[PDB]
């Protein structure tokens, strides 16, 4: 509702999923683990976002 | 002592040095306003010596009862001069010499197990006083 997703979490969610949908899981806690691999981040709440959004669309 | 609360446990012991002849009364016990806040005198002297119950836990937990560390922090709950209320220091006076009323340094030679334990023997009797 009121927690919309900014550009960087939106414009990186595509560019990892259309590339690394393979060997990717639905489990967010290990989807937490894979974001430090396939890209870099400066901070852990962004991996709380950029893994949370891809998993809020992964079943979709 | 760490028995039941020292409302009345202060009240009994105030009578007992008053009982035992060891009053050692200050000659201006009807003069002083016991600090720079009171509009009236106290009712009587029966607080003035009674804080041996306070030091029995303060020799136990705070310090040897130096008078400067004594008078500052207890008995300050004051409203001073009207713009606005503040804190005090209470400026004791004669109970600097209440060690004589008991007869690195230590402040009591009888409040280890000698005369404090009498008050415990009073409160052990006060257990029997409160037995009905």
């Amino acid at each position: 509702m009121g927690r919309v997703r900014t550009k960087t979490v939106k414009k990186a969610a595509k560019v990892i999923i259309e590339k690394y949908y393979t060997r990717l899981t639905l489990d967010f806690h290990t989807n937490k683990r894979i974001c430090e691999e396939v890209a870099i981040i400066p901070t852990k709440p962004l991996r709380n976002k950029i893994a949370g959004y891809v998993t809020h669309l992964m079943g979709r | 002592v760490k028995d039941i609360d020292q409302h009345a446990v202060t009240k009994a012991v105030a009578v007992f040095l008053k009982k035992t002849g060891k009053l050692k009364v200050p000659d201006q016990m009807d003069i002083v306003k016991t600090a720079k806040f009171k509009e009236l005198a106290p009712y009587d002297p029966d607080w003035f010596y009674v804080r041996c119950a306070s030091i029995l836990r303060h020799l136990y937990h705070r310090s040897p009862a130096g008078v400067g560390s004594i008078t500052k922090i207890y008995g300050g709950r004051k409203r001073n001069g009207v713009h606005p209320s503040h804190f005090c220091r209470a400026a004791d006076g004669a109970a600097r010499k209440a060690l004589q009323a008991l007869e690195g340094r230590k402040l009591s030679s009888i409040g280890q197990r000698d005369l404090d334990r009498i008050a415990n023997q009073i409160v052990f009797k006060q257990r029997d006083a409160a037995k009905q």
Partner: protein
């Protein structure tokens, strides 16, 4: 019981207040002297207003007239260092009321710092009087 409403010099006493607080109704004495001059005149402070018959309250007048012999020190008085005749007094609506214009009328000749301010009406203790006191 018996009579409650007594009469002392230039005052009166109500029949409800304690003897210490009804002592404050006398001019020139506050609640300081409730423990000071009543126990010095051995008046029991817990006595009600009906009590303290006149054989006891006349000794309080002797503390009023003679405060020095009743173990009242100098730094517990009304006015110290007279300096006129050097004596020390505590005055209860008899001489203190005359003592108001006294020590003012001397300083009119002196025209001191706080002396001549009493003519037009101002404050002798320093406050910025330009704003308040319209």
């Amino acid at each position: 019981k018996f009579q409650h409403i007594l009469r002392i010099m230039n005052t009166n006493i109500d029949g409800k207040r304690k003897v210490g607080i009804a002592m404050t109704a006398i001019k020139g004495v506050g609640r300081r002297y409730s423990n000071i001059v009543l126990k010095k005149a051995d008046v029991d402070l817990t006595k009600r207003a009906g009590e303290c018959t006149e054989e006891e309250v006349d000794k309080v007048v002797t503390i009023i007239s003679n405060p020095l012999q009743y173990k009242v020190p100098n730094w517990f008085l009304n006015r110290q260092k007279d300096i006129i005749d050097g004596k020390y007094w505590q005055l209860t609506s008899s001489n203190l009321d005359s003592k108001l214009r006294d020590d003012l009328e001397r300083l009119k000749k002196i025209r001191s710092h706080r002396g001549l301010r009493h003519y037009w009406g101002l404050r002798v203790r320093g406050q910025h009087t330009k704003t308040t006191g319209r």
